[PDB]
Every structure is written in structure tokens, then in C-alpha cells.
Amino acid sequence: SCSCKRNFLCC
């Protein structure tokens, strides 16, 4: 996955 810790809207 992408960085959810950063961009939580990514997931």
C-alpha cells in the first residue's frame, strides 16, 4: 500500500 501514516486518504 501507499503511506497511510502520511496520507491516510491514500488507502
Compute and round to an integer the Cα radius of gyration of the chain. 5
Alpha-helical regions (H) of 1-11:
none
Q: Give the integer Cα–Cα distance in Å for 1 and 9.
A: 12
Asked whether the beta carbons of 10 and 3 are under 8 A apart, the reply is yes
Q: Is 5 helix (H, G, I), strand (E, B) or coil?
A: coil
Asked whether the beta carbons of 11 and 2 are under 8 A apart, the reply is yes
| Residue count (the chain) | 11
Method: NMR
Asked whether the beta carbons of 9 and 1 are under 8 A apart, the reply is no
Please give the distance of CA 7 from its chain centroid, rounded to a whole number. 4
Residue with cell 500500500: 1
The answer for 4, left when phi > 0, alpha when psi is -120 to 50, beta otherwise, is alpha
